[PDB]
Each structure stands twice: as C-alpha cells, then as structure tokens.
C-alpha cells in the first residue's frame, strides 16, 4: 500500500499536457 496510485493520476495529467 505505497499509494503510488497518486503517481498514476499524475501521469494522466501529462497526457492532457501533451494533447
């Protein structure tokens, strides 16, 4: 339970930044 899940959401913001 490292809650890295947050990093995953951060990677999603990067997609909207490249789009």
Curated annotation (Swiss-Prot):
Highest rank taxon of the organism: Bacteria
Protein's recorded name: Large ribosomal subunit protein uL1
Taxonomy of the source species: Bacteria, Pseudomonadati, Campylobacterota, Epsilonproteobacteria, Campylobacterales
Role noted for this protein: Binds directly to 23S rRNA. The L1 stalk is quite mobile in the ribosome, and is involved in E site tRNA release.
Family: Belongs to the universal ribosomal protein uL1 family.
Subunit structure: Part of the 50S ribosomal subunit.
């Amino acid at each position: 339970a490292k809650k890295v899940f947050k990093r995953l959401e951060k990677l999603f913001s990067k997609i909207w930044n490249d789009k």
